[PDB]
Structure formats: C-alpha cells, structure tokens
C-alpha cells in the first residue's frame, strides 16, 4: 500500500520507514528536521520505493502533499517530544502537537486516506493514574502541556472519525529506546546514558533516582504501528509498553552493565513536568492486535550500546 | 475583586461584565471584535471601574496585559463560536479555542491569577451522549472541531491546575439565548427567529426540524459564572442549562406567539457538525454551586423578542 510517515527523519519514524519498506510498501517520509536527522534516512537514497518531503506540519500545504502522494495510511509521528520543552513553551508544543495534527487530519479527510495512526504518549497522558499498570480505561489526566497536546490530538482525530469516517487508532507508547535515539538531548535517557558512559562523560539522575518508567524497545513499537495500520482496533488507543517499571537508578545500572562502565551517576534536582511513576497495562494490544513486546530491557540496552559502538 | 473577561464585547461576555460591575468588582474587558459588538459595551464609557483592551488572544501579549491589570479571576469567554465555521476551517477554530486558551493559561500562571473560569460547550462536547439528560460523568465525545477544541481547552486548563496550582472551573452552557445576542449572527437560533419574524422575512429549520436543544437564558448563565468564580468546584465542569428539551420546530411556535402573526417556517438540508439531540443534567450545579435556572423558555422568549422589537 501507499504509506506516509510524518516525523520520518526521527528515531521511531525512520525505523518505521525501514519496516514499511521491508513489508513491500511505498513510503513517503515527511520531516522538517526539528529534532530528526537526514542521516537516519540517508541509506534510502537509491530506493525508488521511498520519497522524502521536507515540510513543517504546522504551515506546509499538507493538502497538496497528500493529494500528490495519496497515502492509504498516515503514520503520524511528527511532534514536539520533550516534556520540559513543553513546560517552557506550551504554545509551541500545542502548535506542533495539536494544530499540526488538526491540519493533517483536515488534509487527510479530503484525499481518500483510509486511516491515520496517531502517536500519543502512554507514558504521560494518564498523569498520576488510579492504578499501575495503567489500562486505557483509566481517565486521561495530563500533568504536562506535552501530555495535554497528545490527549487533544487523540480527541481531534476521534472527531474527524465521527465527522468524515476518517479511521484512526492511537499508538500510546511508554518510554521508547534503541538504535537511532539521539544521545545529545535531554530526553531519551537510554541513549543519553549509553553514549555518555561509552565516552566517559558524566551522567545524572533526577531527584532521588526512584522515578520509574516502562522501557519498550523501538522494534516492538514499530511492530505495533504496523499491526494497527490495518482495519483493526478502529477508534481505539493502545498502550504500547512492557508493563514493567524500571527506576532511573536501575536503568543507569543496566546501561553501565551493558557498556561495562562505572555505575556512579550524579544526583540533580527534580524536573517540573516529569511524573514519578509510569507503567502500562498492555492487555488490549495483546487481545486486539496480537501484539506483545519481544525485547527485554537487558537485550534492548545491549543492542543500543552496540549501535553507539558501531556508529560511523 | 479584580476580574478580567475575555470575549467581553460579546453576548454573554458583556452581560457578565455588567453583572460583575454591579457586584462591586473592577473589570477589564478584552476582545478583538471578531463577532463581538462595541454597542454591547458603549454604556460603560464613563465607568472608571471598567477598562477595555482591544486584543486577539492568539497573538496579543497576554502576559503583559495580565501583568498590568493583575486580575484575580479570569473569565474566559473569547472563542470561535460557530460549529459550521469550525468544520469549514478547523485550523482557525483550533487556533482561537485551543492555542488562545493555552496562551491565556500560560500568561495567567505567571501573573498571580487565582482562577480561570473556562467556557466549554455543554451542548456539543458530549456529541451523541449515552443518556439524556446528560450528566458531566458522561464521557466527552465531540463530533465537530468546535466541540473538540472546547474539550481540549478544559484539558489544558486541568493540566495547568496540576502543574502550577492555577485553579480552574469549566462552565458548560447549553443553548444560551437572550438580549444582546447577534440578530445577524450565524449562531443563535432564538435571535434568528425573533429578528426574522419581526421583519416579516423567511424563517427556516434544518433537517426535518426535529433536532432538540436545551434553551437557557443569558442571565442564568451569567449567575453560574459568578457562583463558580469562588473557591468551589476546582477542576470540575458544570453543565449550565434547564434540563428541558425543545426542538427546532417547537421553538419557532414559541417565538411566533411572542412576536405575533405567522408560524410557518421552511425546511433546508442538515448541516455537518450539528448534533441531533441536546439536554443537560443540571443536578451537579444545583448540589455544588446552589445554581438553578430562573427563566423558563416562554418567559425568556418574551424578554428576547421584546428586546429585539425595541432594537
Ligand atoms: N520516544 C519515546 O519514548 C516516545 C514514546 C511515546 C511517544 N513518543 C512519540 O513518538 C513520536 C516520535 O518520537 P521519537 O522518539 O522518534 O523522537 P524524534 O524527535 O526523533 O521524532 C520526532 C520527529 O518529528 C519531527 N518533527 C517535529 N516537529 C515537526 C514539524 N512541525 N513538522 C514536521 N516534522 C516535525 C522531528 O524533526 C523528528 O524527526 C512523537 O510523536 C513522540 O511524541 C515518543
Ligand atoms: N451562546 C451559546 O449558546 C453558548 C453556549 C455554550 C458555549 N458558548 C461559549 O460562550 C462564549 C461566549 O459566546 P457568545 O454566545 O457570547 O458569542 P459571541 O460571539 O457574542 O462572544 C464571543 C466573543 O469572543 C470574541 N473573540 C473571538 N475570537 C477572539 C479572539 N481571537 N480574541 C479575542 N476575542 C475573541 C468575539 O469577538 C466575541 O465578543 C464562547 O466561549 C462560546 O463558545 C456559547
Ligand atoms: O540524563 C537523564 C535523563 C533522564 N533521566 C530520567 O529518565 C526518565 C525518562 O526521561 P526521558 O526524558 O528520557 O523521557 P520521558 O519520561 O520524559 O518520556 C515521555 O515523553 C516521551 C516522548 O519523548 C514519551 O511520550 C513517553 O511516553 C513519556 O513518558 C525520567 O524518569 C528521568 O528522570 C535521567 O535519570 N537522566
Ligand atoms: O436558521 C436557523 C439556525 C439554526 N437552527 C437550529 O437551531 C439549533 C441551535 O443552533 P445554534 O447555531 O443557535 O447553536 P448550536 O446548537 O450550534 O450551539 C452550540 O454552540 C454554541 C456556541 O455557539 C454552544 O457551545 C452550545 O452549547 C452548542 O450546542 C440547531 O438545532 C439548528 O439546526 C434553526 O432551526 N434555524
């Protein structure tokens, strides 16, 4: 089928592109390189099945783009990704994550797109939830602007589903990690730890290091995207994680073990916007999509460290 | 208290301005006249307790404005109000209703504001609801971009409440009608019927005219805004309506009885985005705020028609 991936030059996006190409699809990648990198797609230069469009979802003529490329499925991964950045500038975050999503939906409903697969944030949309691991039936209760825009994105797509019959499902990942994740930002802790420890540069945890996240390997997330792209799970959000909690301190230890380096992080002050715990109930994804995470943290971390070691 | 009202040149907004001033508050009104009218505020020219700011919530320096005026409560009524327009231009609707709300919250949290009273849409946010009358416990299920943006506004304000402790409550009105509603606007059916029947111009219904709404008078809505502005109902939405259903067709008869003469409208195609039924459970507002509507449709229609006739 014809596929279009927004955020295609990014970590998850470029990985998804590779998978869709392997599955025999024609893929249009779309990105403005806000946080994505051309290097993530450079290996595709001579692949006729891939076309890249440099575009900002906030202002580009998405109607024209979709009219030309006629995707059957749009995988919407383009977003402002950093929780702290969303606190610092909530308007910008809302522009990219809400307005960008709205413009894309409005373009899509006009061009015969069958389905949009949205990227939510299973890690943050529930805020501090009533129970862990947290099912999709739990109320959204965002406590950062990033989380709020992700929620608003889902709701708008649900609206376009009612209005035009434009199908949607929402992939709501926990904390995704693996090869191609940028080690030089403030988000993407696995990447940050791996490269810093390989380079012998300082590392840090925040608060007392007891905050937990649910760490899910990129390939597993990509598989969920592909599964939900079919006429399955229409209208639904799916938590995409492992349902296991790892503390900041425990993560550091795991990455240090994989690197074979010291396990001696610095301790820095808490970050406003960051939840204390995150753990997803992944039963619905199993039931509806037949999806289960295959990669355990130890193995995923090893593969991530190797990515940094082999980097040219 | 010091109050700021966004959308103050509008129908509900200017009415709320009057109420707050009467209650002894100082008021800053803010509007860009997208749909509001200067005539709604012209009587305030000489009142020093009131200051008006011409500003667009999407682009204005809201931080500077709120820093200057230091409002304790912000009543947020500025919005793109038309469902059909939201379908025509979802991006614009989202810019005003979502981005505008986000910019206001971000300004408010930095400027010592105690509470934002948001205006949601009780009539539309539930979409086709699981029951009637519809309680606030019913899930939101918007079926127009307008409704979606209203829900998104609520959620962003709830977010700012968690993040910064900026208090918020959501007033979710049904179908508000009464004096100062734009007779020449695209929204406002009671205004449309009143204006047209007074002019002897044609009146029309969409679909087969079976679509129902909950008609709540402006003065009752304003009272709910006042009640919820206190330290009560934090983080909560309140349906503000009558809990009584009136169809597109049945309203026409009421207006014609008030105006006089003929009672025979046309019948045009349904419009994309418009729901079929709407009726709000108003129990929560009663229990929590002590709010009850005072004005019944017949009485409210008389008032509205009389107002329009006087011009
Ligand atoms: N990594 C995680 O833990 C995780 C899990 C849940 C949610 N997500 C979501 O996954 C998606 C991909 O994130 P990622 O981890 O690969 O990070 P990333 O930064 O590599 O991916 C985001 C991509 O979107 C692009 N982009 C940003 N703004 C854009 C705009 N206005 N127009 C066009 N392109 C734009 C960036 O340039 C980048 O390539 C995002 O929607 C993110 O919110 C990430
Ligand atoms: N009338 C109803 O039935 C009803 C009920 C539920 C919800 N609402 C909400 O009530 C509020 C008031 O609506 P109304 O019925 O008085 O209509 P209105 O059009 O008279 O009031 C809206 C006001 O907002 C102003 N405004 C719009 N965009 C603006 C912007 N970008 N910057 C600054 N000001 C801007 C308009 O100029 C106008 O004065 C709105 O938030 C509306 O969505 C209306
Ligand atoms: O140098 C660092 C960086 C981070 N952390 C810790 O690592 C964890 C994860 O932080 P990230 O910034 O890597 O990611 P987030 O938890 O902010 O991720 C959130 O945003 C993502 C988008 O980037 C996804 O949406 C995800 O679901 C959501 O939880 C936190 O507990 C943080 O304290 C450290 O200990 N040291
Ligand atoms: O000439 C007309 C115009 C409208 N209508 C009918 O009148 C009803 C009300 O339409 P309005 O445009 O007056 O208002 P909405 O129903 O669109 O109101 C919605 O948007 C409002 C904001 O403008 C509020 O948010 C409200 O809660 C929400 O239901 C509809 O059934 C419509 O079909 C007619 O019969 N004839």
């Amino acid at each position: 089928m014809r596929a279009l991936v927004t955020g295609a030059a990014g970590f998850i996006g470029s990985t998804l592109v590779d998978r869709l190409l392997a599955d025999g699809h024609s893929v249009v990648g779309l990105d403005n390189f806000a946080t994505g990198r051309a290097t993530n797609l450079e290996h595709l230069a001579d692949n006729s099945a891939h076309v890249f469009v440099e575009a900002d979802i906030v202002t580009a003529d998405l109607h024209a783009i979709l009219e030309q490329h006629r995707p059957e499925v749009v995988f919407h991964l383009a977003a402002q990704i950093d929780v702290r950045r969303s606190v610092a500038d909530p308007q910008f975050d809302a522009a990219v994550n809400v307005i960008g999503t709205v413009r894309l939906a409005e373009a899509a409903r006009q061009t015969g797109v069958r389905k949009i697969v949205h990227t939510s944030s299973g890690g943050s949309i529930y805020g501090t939830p009533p129970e862990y691991p947290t099912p999709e039936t739990a109320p959204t209760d965002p406590a950062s602007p990033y989380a709020a825009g992700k929620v608003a994105g889902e709701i708008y797509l649900n609206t376009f589903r009612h209005l035009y019959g434009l199908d949607c499902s929402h992939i709501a990942p926990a904390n995704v990690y693996g090869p191609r994740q940028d080690p030089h930002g403030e988000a993407g802790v696995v990447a940050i730890f791996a490269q810093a420890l390989l380079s012998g540069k300082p590392t840090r945890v925040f608060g007392d290091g007891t905050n937990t996240r649910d760490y899910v390997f990129v390939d597993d997330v990509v598989d969920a995207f592909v599964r939900v792209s079919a006429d399955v799970g229409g209208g639904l959000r799916f938590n995409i994680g492992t349902g296991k909690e790892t503390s900041d301190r425990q993560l550091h230890s795991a990455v240090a073990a994989a690197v074979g380096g010291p396990d001696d992080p610095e301790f820095h002050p808490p970050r406003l916007g960051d939840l204390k715990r995150s753990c997803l109930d992944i039963g619905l994804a199993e039931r509806v999509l037949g999806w289960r995470p295959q990669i355990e943290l130890a193995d995923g971390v090893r593969r991530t460290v190797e990515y940094f070691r082999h980097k040219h």
Side-chain angles (χ1 to χ4, degrees), chain A residues 1-243 245-311:
Chain A
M1 74 184 178
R2 288 176 299 272
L4 189 145
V5 177
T6 75
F11 155 48
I12 305 172
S14 69
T15 313
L16 179 58
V17 164
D18 284 329
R19 168 64 187 270
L20 289 167
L21 289 172
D23 284 353
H25 306 299
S26 181
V27 181
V28 177
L30 184 152
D31 211 290
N32 73 338
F33 302 113
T35 58
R37 294 176 58 235
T39 165
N40 286 334
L41 293 169
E42 65 182 14
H43 64 287
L44 296 178
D46 308 315
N47 192 335
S48 61
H50 175 258
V51 172
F52 182 82
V53 174
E54 187 180 345
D56 184 339
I57 63 172
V58 174
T59 52
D61 188 347
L62 292 175
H63 182 285
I65 292 161
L66 295 195
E67 220 184 44
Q68 179 177 356
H69 294 283
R70 296 291 177 166
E72 174 179 335
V73 178
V74 174
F75 297 91
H76 179 40
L77 278 72
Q80 203 295 114
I81 62 84
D82 188 291
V83 163
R84 285 71 49 189
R85 282 189 199 180
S86 81
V87 169
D89 187 352
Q91 175 180 348
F92 180 78
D93 176 86
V96 178
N97 295 1
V98 184
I99 297 299
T101 300
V102 170
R103 296 185 78 252
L104 179 66
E106 172 64 358
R109 66 92 182 174
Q110 289 176 268
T111 62
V113 176
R114 171 176 58 78
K115 186 167 185 166
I116 296 180
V117 185
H118 187 41
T119 315
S120 192
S121 173
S124 68
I125 59 173
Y126 304 102
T128 305
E131 64 184 295
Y132 308 91
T134 311
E136 298 87 349
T137 50
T140 58
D141 202 357
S144 69
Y146 170 80
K150 285 308 200 171
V151 173
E154 290 188 13
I155 290 164
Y156 264 102
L157 287 173
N158 299 331
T159 297
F160 276 79
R161 191 172 196 262
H162 281 306
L163 247 194
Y164 293 114
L166 173 68
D167 200 16
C168 60
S169 293
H170 317 295
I171 290 293
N175 281 55
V176 190
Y177 72 98
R180 289 186 185 165
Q181 189 169 47
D182 187 320
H184 299 304
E186 288 302 323
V189 56
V190 176
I192 299 168
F193 287 171
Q195 180 68 78
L197 291 168
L198 279 168
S199 293
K201 283 163 175 172
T203 54
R204 60 184 179 173
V205 294
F206 301 104
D208 64 1
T210 64
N211 289 6
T212 67
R213 298 290 190 269
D214 179 344
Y215 292 99
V216 60
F217 190 72
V218 63
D219 288 354
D220 290 325
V221 178
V222 166
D223 191 66
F225 273 110
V226 165
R227 287 177 177 259
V228 83
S229 64
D231 187 3
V232 290
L236 302 178
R237 179 207 305 128
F238 297 94
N239 294 337
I240 299 302
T242 66
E245 282 176 78
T246 305
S247 77
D248 293 348
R249 188 69 195 81
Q250 283 160 352
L251 202 249
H252 195 276
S253 295
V255 179
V259 169
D263 180 27
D264 206 351
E266 301 182 5
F267 282 77
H268 287 232
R271 302 194 300 194
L272 180 70
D274 282 357
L275 297 170
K276 301 291 198 299
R277 284 178 70 185
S278 178
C279 191
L280 297 186
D281 184 339
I282 54 167
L284 182 72
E286 171 153 26
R287 288 194 302 283
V288 178
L289 301 175
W291 179 89
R292 288 165 307 281
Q294 306 296 310
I295 311 300
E296 305 191 57
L297 183 64
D299 298 309
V301 163
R302 171 178 45 74
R303 286 172 61 182
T304 305
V305 168
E306 286 179 347
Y307 164 78
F308 288 113
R309 283 183 68 174
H310 304 333
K311 243 186 162 179

